[PDB]
């Protein structure tokens, strides 16, 4: 081919232009986004029932509701919690890469049936069904700075006026509110109300028909009478639409012309719907609005546009409406991106400079430099051709690739300025015969190569994906290169292609170097010993080298964990937050840019007891060293945050890839299996746990991820008496209910927007068991009785939250592997410890530990198939079940250079490093092929003699190898390997190669020629 | 889709079905007329009965099996237990009661429900102690029921 | 009997919500006196209706 | 599926009451397993006459 | 605070408008380049295209 191309090289430039054009369209046509989509698609199922408690949600709710999720398609496992405030989550994670639209349907649309026995309280607030993701794009916040706006007025307004703003913009995959929107609140007081002989009920019904919408004919429309002329539309009753109109309800009339309004029994007011999440940002009333991708738009444009939109519109509604951004995943990309093409770009530059040095020239260093770029640019429309997209995984995907792009270029031009030097024809046959000796080699080192990459797009789950990112990238990059070096390079440099010591001073060490080696090869098998050492030793390292996923990275935000004890309460958890605000604003001004904390969330389950506080730091810039960054800022916090009360406050940096498989940790759910109840399970739960901590050997930190039985104050209606006293068990129940958990009457419309109305007694009358009393039912005769009449109080313990693994009660426990030990050998103890527990009690794995378990280990079988097809290819570049066997024993030489990222640097075997550890066994075994080709080429052609060849064949190679080897090792040591911020996977990417490259040379030069003969002669023996 | 399409429509007759249909939910599904497969489950030591099994089975294993890909309908050769109130007329004719009566009972004395709680959700000036208020539960044994007061 | 009444009651809601949804080109509703409402979505061509 | 069903139950077998055995009547799987293997033997086999 | 868009035919129409001045461009360029490869002459095309 490159012969028929060197010829018309006017063509191999058209070709070089489409390929190029196609990465411009494709650069444009490309998604961009911090990561891609790598978690399995969960649907969560949210439910609320104002004032339940667990059993009362579990058994009014979860269940059944379970019971009937039953004939959706690809589902993996389901859990489910039911906790003490109404709520029911119920995620259902699904098989690998289903259809999310299609799951979610189905999931839901099979909800649709469900409902019928969901109870009228729930049916009304909606169950919504929707998609995993509970952190993405940015989180705008909306603050006051007057003391004008409470939460709710801020939440309202946001909901009133901007929430759809935003939620319709190029991107914007849905909006979600950090508040409510006004509520017709309506706070009863059994006093001002027993005075009228009225229960909440009559408050309830009153608000019902005083505020509804009633049908009403037109005037004709239907069949009318001969010759009419009037059609209109009659307009009966209409929703109330204020605090006023509401205060005017005839709840009663006594014979005195008596005027018992609503506000005479309560107090109307614009309120919020839920009252139990206190959001502030910097000491300050808050009401954010979270907002996610858009599925196939661009983190970068998108943020812009949302910044945009806000900007057009804060010219509006009074006071301070200051709009903060206390989270953006925007920098963290851009700043990556910028530093990524910084890498490529410069790793070229370096080619050019490491191109004077090796070739006195210029129109040859001008080659690698219009060929990489043409290999990249097309590796942009391969990506866009398998959908992919621009994200931190894919990016580094071609940086851990640079090495092999580059190399392939210098590799060709430089075979030309060997053969057009060493007594040779012009460009013409220089190339033709040059290209010729690499031609086959160049191809065939596709195959072999692809085989040490492809594999990797086959892996497990959540993980597998990351890999596939990397896998394609490299392939379609690398495999792109080959093709472009058999076509634009042969004919490129063949068409432009024609110190004071270094030149002859390299032509020195070369000679000196092959001597050395000529003795190596007298002795022969001498060094094969000094090799098995280097094998053996890798083996010691592999094992020693710690494991992981993606080294954490500083993201300019992290979190604080407040977690007040058992029965806590809001007021008293704020104070905590205020300190975790202060001891962040004060003892850390040069770094805290904004605390945004909120109580009633701490994703361990909700309730005045717990908040959580996300702080967002100032720019990495203004954060100099170690101490001024996260690991470090959080270091100090955490420790400075114990000394605090009896309120556990943690801080921690977000994990790499938010939505994904954190710690190398395990996830362990205890399921229930029979009758055993909450209690029995609680028994198992505890035994197992206690077990576990008497085994710090296998190391550990088992925890129940979930909550203790707390105490419960329990009314307990006395049916007899209630009949007996002439008092309907509905009226009791209700009145207790709406006094205390509130109930939600009907809606009404508020400056244009239907908005719920809630009825529930002021707080004053609802705080202490001791108030039960204030509360009085009308009974059958106009006799207003009280509690003690027909009810009795008792404390109990029970659950605030209640666990259930697919269909059925379940706990949840998670702990770490073992300073010492492997996630896998640790699973397996925790499962023996699980082996020997009270029958009934099952146990099964979730998260991460379905991944790791299921697929889990496959390194093996997938590598067999490379180390196999590496051979089968390689041998037919050669004709030999034996000669290939010399190109292989390279593999280790490259490994140990890599793996001394152990004992020079504080690192661990992790995707960023394996992917390196791949990229290095490319360069390496292709050194191997080229070389052992050149050593073939002689012998096969002009019989140039058993070793005569080996010595000559390295003799003609030590440049190329030393050439790129030099490009790269500088190519990687830049910021890559030394870096302040937006980094980490930087360190990861480099340190890998950087070290693994060293030896991949420094060992290679000597061994490979060894290898060649050691094997070509052994195979023709005695 | 089809499975889809079908239940778009359905869905606009929910709200005309009799509450009692309704409420034993309607189902839509896709699958094969014939059976994939039948899974006996007998018991060795005559330790439980025909009944007993069919409860255990429904309580135990009709779950997962229906919830579980391309399993798309498990018949169940049996039925799960239910609270049972084999009436007798004579009597309610005697003490002067109809099922209607009996029924309304059954909803009242057998029922789960929803207080509120003491640290009152939007609370007051300045308060420690918050915790839920539990009232009526859901009955739970042969016994609870028919001690229901008529 | 309800003019704006509908538009704010069903129509609005149903709209606030019509975000996310891929390939969507433009949406176009209208209340009604008789209280009927038609939200309408229309997506970039050759998109997959089902 | 069958495999999955079967190794569901299989997953809930150490915890039934006293003496309760999934038995296995009418199941249409293993023929389509045997059968389709029956053939396979034939391929190899008549490799060996040829 | 008032404005407009088009719908159906129109928004198709306008969309089909402003598209031509790319539809021509790119199509040209594709031929020109084809000719190059074909007639091995970074010059012969120039002709043809003129
Ligand atoms: C498994 O999902 C998660 C996991 C962990 C912790 C969290 C979440 C989570 O999803 C989550 C939220 O989705 C929301 C919030 C939130 O704090 C979390 C998590 O903490 C805070 C929020 O309630 C406010 O800040 C309101 O003032 C807004 C928002 O509400 C969402 C979630 C509701 N359940 C949903 O029905 C509503 C419309 O949007």
Look up the CATH number of the domain holding residue A747: 3.30.2090.10
Chain C residues whose beta carbon lies within 8 Å of the beta carbon of residue A293: none
The DSSP 8-state label assigned to residue A784 in this structure reads: E
D3 touches chain B (CB under 8 A): no
Tell whether ligand 1 has an atom less than 6 A from the beta carbon of residue A816: no
Tell whether ligand 1 has an atom less than 6 A from the beta carbon of residue A139: no
Do A866 and A982 belong together in one domain?
yes
Which protein residue has the closest C-alpha to ligand 1 atom 33?
A46
Q: What are φ and ψ of residue A615, in 5° steps?
A: -85, 140
Which protein residue has the closest C-alpha to ligand 1 atom 13?
A134
Determine the atom of ligand 1 nearest the C-alpha atom of A44. 1
d(CA A109, CA A132): 17
Tell whether ligand 1 has an atom less than 6 A from the beta carbon of residue A179: yes
Is there an interface between D and C (3+ Cβ pairs < 8 A)?
A: no
Residues in Cβ contact with A779 at an 8 Å cutoff, skipping those fewer than 6 apart: A725, A726, A727, A728, A731, A785
Q: Counting Cβ atoms within 10 Å, is residue A836 exposed (0-12), middle (13-18) or buried (19+)?
A: exposed
Strand partners, A704: A813
Do A163 and A299 belong together in one domain?
yes
Interface A–B counts its CB contacts (< 8 A) at 175
Ligand 1 centroid–CA A134 distance in Å is: 7
d(CA A922, CA A904): 23
- CA A52 from chain center: how many Å? 33
- 3-class SS at E23? helix
- CA B142 from chain center: how many Å? 16
d(CA A562, CA A601): 10
Do A284 and A163 belong together in one domain?
yes
Determine the atom of ligand 1 nearest the C-alpha atom of A155. 27
The DSSP 8-state label assigned to residue A956 in this structure reads: T
**Between β-strands A710-714 and B132-134, what pairing exists: parallel, antiparallel or unpaired?**
parallel
Give the CA count within 13 Å in the CB-facing half-sphere of A998.
15
Query: Which of A393, A318, A18 lies closest to A146, judged by CA?
Result: A318
Which protein residue has the closest C-alpha to ligand 1 atom 3?
A134
Query: Which of A1010, A1007, A1004, A999 lies closest to A917, judged by CA?
Result: A999
How far separated are the first and last CA of chain B, in Å rounded?
Answer: 51
Do A287 and A222 belong together in one domain?
no
Do A363 and A455 belong together in one domain?
yes
Taking a C-beta distance cutoff of 8 angstroms, is the pair A457, A446 a contact?
A: no
Ligand 1 centroid–CA A583 distance in Å is: 26
Query: Which of A158, A167, A170 lies closest to A316, judged by CA?
Result: A158
d(CA A78, CA A63): 12
d(CA A367, CA A496): 9
CB contact under 8 A, A276 and B72: no
The DSSP 8-state label assigned to residue B105 in this structure reads: H
Strand partners, A650: A561
Strands (E), A706-782: 710-714, 743-744, 748-749, 754-755, 758-759, 776-778
Output the CA–CA distances (angstroms, integers) from residue E33 to A18, A21, A484, B62, E40, in the order listed.
Answer: 9, 12, 18, 67, 10
- 3-class SS at A165? helix
Task: Tell me the residue range of the domain where A753 lies.
Answer: 710-798
Classify each residue of A840-877 as buried b or exposed e, where b means 16 or more C-beta atoms within 10 Å of its C-beta. Answer: bbbbbbbbbbbbbbeebeeeeeeeeebeebbbebbbeb
- Computed on alpha carbons and rounded to an integer, the radius of gyration of chain A in Å comes to 36
The DSSP 8-state label assigned to residue A309 in this structure reads: H
Chain E residues whose beta carbon lies within 8 Å of the beta carbon of residue A4: none
Question: What chain B residue is nearest to C50 in terms of C-alpha separation?
Answer: B1
What part of A 829-858 touches D (C-beta under 8 Å)? 839-840, 842
Chain A residues whose beta carbon lies within 8 Å of the beta carbon of residue B26: 113
Tell whether ligand 1 has an atom less than 6 A from the beta carbon of residue A279: yes
- CA A805 from chain center: how many Å? 23
Task: Give the method of determination.
Answer: X-ray
Query: Which of A89, A136, A182 lies closest to A290, judged by CA?
Result: A136
**Between β-strands A909-910 and A547-548, what pairing exists: parallel, antiparallel or unpaired?**
parallel
Taking a C-beta distance cutoff of 8 angstroms, is the pair A242, A270 a contact?
A: no
Query: In this structure, what token pair is assigned to residue A885?
Result: 């066997």
Ligand 1 centroid–CA A48 distance in Å is: 13
D20 touches chain A (CB under 8 A): no
d(CA B62, CA A66): 12
Do A312 and A405 belong together in one domain?
no
Output the CA–CA distances (angstroms, integers) from residue E49 to E19, E35, E43, in the order listed.
Answer: 22, 9, 10
Residues in Cβ contact with C27 at an 8 Å cutoff, skipping those fewer than 6 apart: C15, C18, C39, C40, C41, C42
User: Residue B38 is nearest to which of D9, D12, D27, comparing CB atoms?
Assistant: D27
Ligand 1 centroid–CA A744 distance in Å is: 21
d(CA A936, CA A406): 25
Q: What distance separates the 2 farthest-apart alpha carbons in chain B?
A: 67
Interface B–D counts its CB contacts (< 8 A) at 77
Question: What chain B residue is nearest to C49 in terms of C-alpha separation?
Answer: B1
Do A416 and A355 belong together in one domain?
yes
Do A586 and A720 belong together in one domain?
no
Residue from A88, A182, A278, A601 whose mutation best tests the ligand 1 pocket (most atoms within 8 A of CB): A601
- CA A642 from chain center: how many Å? 29
Ligand 1 centroid–CA A978 distance in Å is: 38
Query: In this structure, what token pair is assigned to residue A145?
Result: 């700075």
Tell whether ligand 1 has an atom less than 6 A from the beta carbon of residue A603: yes
Query: In this structure, what token pair is assigned to residue A237?
Result: 């009753």
Is there an interface between B and E (3+ Cβ pairs < 8 A)?
A: no
Do A269 and A365 belong together in one domain?
no
SS3 content of chain A, % helix, strand, coil (to 5): 45, 10, 45
Counting the structural domains of chain A, the total is: 8
Is there an interface between A and E (3+ Cβ pairs < 8 A)?
A: yes
Residue from A603, A604, A659, A705 whose mutation best tests the ligand 1 pocket (most atoms within 8 A of CB): A603
A798 membership: H or E segment, kind and range: strand A794-798
CB contact under 8 A, D25 and B44: no
Tell whether ligand 1 has an atom less than 6 A from the beta carbon of residue A176: yes
Do A348 and A390 belong together in one domain?
yes
Do A646 and A780 belong together in one domain?
no
- CA A31 from chain center: how many Å? 17
For residue A963, the domain's CATH number is: 1.20.1640.10
Torsion A736-A741-A746-A748 (CA) sign:
positive
Got the DSSP string for A665-685?
A: -EEEE----SS--HHHHHHHH
Strand partners, A291: A175
User: Which position has the token pair 């890498």?
Assistant: A343
Provide the 10 A C-beta neighbour count for residue D10. 12
Output the CA–CA distances (angstroms, integers) from residue A790 to A302, A795, B138, in the order listed.
Answer: 61, 17, 19
Chain B residues whose beta carbon lies within 8 Å of the beta carbon of residue A767: 118-120, 123-124, 127
D22: distance to nearest CA of chain A, Å?
A: 17
- 3-class SS at A557? strand
Determine the atom of ligand 1 nearest the C-alpha atom of A91. 1
Long-range contacts for A684-692 (Cβ within 8 Å, ≥24 apart)? A684/A837, A684/A838, A684/A840, A684/A841, A685/A811, A685/A813, A687/A837, A687/A838, A688/A813, A688/A833, A688/A834, A688/A837, A689/A813, A691/A833, A692/A815, A692/A830, A692/A833
A10 touches chain E (CB under 8 A): yes
Query: Which of A605, A598, A413, A421 lies closest to A493, judged by CA?
Result: A413
Query: In this structure, what token pair is assigned to residue C23?
Result: 């390939």
Query: In this structure, what token pair is assigned to residue B32?
Result: 């094969």
Interface B–C counts its CB contacts (< 8 A) at 3
How far separated are the first and last CA of chain A, in Å rounded?
Answer: 43
Which protein residue has the closest C-alpha to ligand 1 atom 35?
A46
d(CA A327, CA A163): 17
Do A444 and A484 belong together in one domain?
yes
**Between β-strands A592-599 and A611-617, what pairing exists: parallel, antiparallel or unpaired?**
antiparallel
Query: In this structure, what token pair is assigned to residue A576?
Result: 């905590």
Chain A residues whose beta carbon lies within 8 Å of the beta carbon of residue C33: 233
Residue A203 sits at the vertex; the CA angle it makes with A199 and A208, to the nearest 5 degrees, is 140
């Amino acid at each position: 081919m490159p012969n028929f191309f060197i010829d018309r090289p006017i063509f191999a430039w058209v070709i070089a232009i489409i390929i190029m054009l196609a990465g411009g369209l494709a650069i444009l046509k490309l998604p961009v986004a911090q990561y891609p989509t790598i978690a399995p698609p969960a649907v969560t199922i949210s439910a609320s029932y104002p004032g339940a408690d667990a059993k009362t949600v579990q058994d009014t709710v979860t269940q059944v509701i379970e019971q009937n999720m039953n004939g959706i398609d690809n589902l993996m496992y389901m859990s489910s919690n039911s906790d003490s405030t109404g709520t029911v989550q119920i995620t259902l994670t699904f098989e690998s890469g289903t259809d999310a639209d299609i799951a979610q349907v189905q999931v839901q649309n099979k909800l649709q049936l469900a409902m019928p026995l969901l109870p009228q309280e729930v049916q009304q607030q909606g169950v919504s069904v929707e998609k995993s993701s509970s952190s993405f794009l940015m989180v705008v916040g909306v603050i006051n700075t007057d003391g004008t706006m409470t939460q709710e007025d801020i939440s309202d307004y946001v909901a009133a006026n901007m929430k759809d703003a935003i939620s319709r913009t190029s991107g914007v995959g849905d909006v979600q509110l950090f508040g409510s929107q006004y509520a017709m609140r309506i706070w009863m007081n059994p006093n001002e109300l027993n005075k009228f002989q009225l229960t909440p009920v009559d408050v309830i019904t009153a608000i019902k028909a005083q505020n509804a919408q009633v049908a009403a004919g037109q005037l004709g429309g239907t069949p009318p009478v001969k010759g009419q002329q009037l059609n209109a539309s009659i307009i009966a009753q209409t929703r109330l639409t204020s605090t006023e109109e509401f205060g005017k309800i005839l709840l009663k009339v006594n014979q005195d012309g008596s005027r018992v309004l609503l506000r005479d029994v309560a107090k109307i007011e614009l309120g919020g719907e839920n009252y139990d999440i206190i959001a502030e940002f910097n000491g300050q009333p808050a009401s954010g609005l979270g907002i996610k991708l858009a599925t196939g738009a661009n983190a970068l444009d998108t943020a812009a546009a949302i910044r945009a939109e806000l900007a057009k519109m804060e010219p509006f509604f009074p006071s301070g409406l200051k709009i903060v951004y206390p989270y953006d995943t925007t920098p963290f990309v851009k700043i990556s991106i910028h530093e990524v093409v910084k890498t490529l770009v410069e790793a070229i530059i370096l080619v050019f400079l490491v191109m004077y040095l090796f070739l006195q020239n210029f129109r040859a260093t001008l080659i690698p430099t219009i060929a990489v770029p043409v290999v990249l640019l097309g590796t942009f429309a391969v990506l866009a051709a398998f959908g992919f997209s621009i994200n931190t995984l894919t990016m580094f995907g071609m940086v851990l690739a640079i090495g092999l792009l580059v190399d392939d270029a210098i590799v060709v031009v430089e075979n030309v300025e060997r053969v057009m030097a060493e007594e040779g024809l012009p460009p013409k046959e220089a190339t033709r015969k040059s290209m010729g000796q690499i031609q086959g080699a160049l191809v065939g080192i596709a195959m072999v190569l692809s085989a040490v990459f492809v594999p990797m797009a086959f892996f497990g789950g959540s993980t597998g994906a990351i890999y596939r990112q990397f896998s394609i990238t490299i392939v379609s990059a690398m495999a792109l290169s080959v093709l472009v070096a058999l076509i634009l390079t042969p004919a490129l440099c063949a068409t432009m292609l024609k110190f004071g010591w270094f030149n002859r001073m390299f032509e020195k060490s070369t000679h000196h170097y092959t001597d050395s080696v000529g003795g190596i090869l007298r002795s022969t098998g001498r060094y094969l010993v000094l090799y098995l050492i280097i094998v053996v030793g890798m083996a010691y390292l592999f094992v020693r080298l710690p494991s992981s996923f993606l080294p954490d990275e500083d993201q300019g935000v992290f979190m604080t964990m407040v977690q007040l004890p058992a029965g806590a309460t809001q007021e008293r958890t704020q104070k905590v937050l205020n300190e975790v605000t202060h001891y962040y604003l004060t003892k850390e001004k040069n770094n805290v840019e904004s605390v945004f904390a909120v109580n009633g969330f701490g994703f361990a389950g909700r309730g005045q007891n717990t908040g959580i506080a996300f702080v967002s730091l100032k720019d990495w810039a203004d954060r100099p060293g170690e101490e001024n960054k996260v690991e470090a800022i959080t270091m100090r916090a955490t420790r400075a945050f114990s000394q605090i009360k009896d309120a556990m406050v943690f801080a921690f940096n977000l994990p790499a890839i938010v939505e994904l498989g954190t710690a190398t940790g395990f996830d362990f759910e205890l399921i229930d299996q029979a009758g055993l109840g909450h209690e029995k399970l609680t028994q198992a739960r505890n035994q197992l746990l206690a077990e576990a901590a008497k085994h710090p050997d296998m190391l550990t930190s088992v925890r129940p991820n979930g909550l203790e039985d707390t105490p419960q104050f329990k009314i307990d209606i006395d049916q007899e008496k209630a009949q007996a006293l002439g008092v309907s068990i509905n009226d009791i129940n209700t009145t207790l209910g709406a006094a205390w958990g509130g109930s939600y009457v009907n809606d009404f419309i508020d400056r244009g927007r239907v908005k719920k109305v809630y009825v529930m007694s002021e707080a004053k009358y609802r705080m202490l068991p001791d108030d039960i009393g204030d509360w009085y039912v009308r009974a059958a005769d106009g006799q207003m009785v009280p509690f003690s009449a027909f009810s009795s109080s008792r404390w109990e313990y029970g659950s605030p939250r209640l666990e259930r693994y697919n269909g059925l009660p379940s706990m949840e426990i998670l702990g770490q592997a073992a300073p010492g030990k492997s996630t896998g050998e640790a699973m397996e103890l925790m499962e023996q410890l699980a082996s020997k527990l009270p029958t009934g009690v099952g146990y099964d794995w979730t998260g991460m530990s379905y991944q790791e378990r299921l697929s889990g280990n496959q390194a093996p079988s997938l590598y067999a198939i490379s180390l196999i097809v590496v051979f089968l290819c390689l041998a037919a570049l050669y004709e030999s079940w034996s000669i290939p066997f010399s190109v292989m024993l390279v593999v280790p030489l490259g490994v140990i250079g890599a793996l001394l990222a152990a004992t020079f640097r504080g690192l661990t075997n992790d995707v960023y490093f394996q992917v390196g550890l791949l990229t290095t066994i490319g360069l390496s075994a292709k050194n191997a092929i080229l070389i052992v080709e050149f050593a073939k080429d002689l012998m096969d052609k002009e019989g140039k003699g058993l070793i005569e060849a080996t010595l000559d064949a390295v003799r003609m190679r030590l440049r190329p190898i030393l050439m790129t080897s030099l490009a790269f090792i500088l190519g990687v040591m830049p910021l890559v390997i030394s870096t302040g911020a937006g980094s980490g996977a930087q360190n990861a990417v480099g340190t890998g190669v950087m070290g693994g490259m060293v030896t991949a040379t420094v060992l290679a030069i000597f061994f490979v020629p060894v290898f060649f003969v050691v094997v070509r002669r052994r195979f023709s023996r005695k």
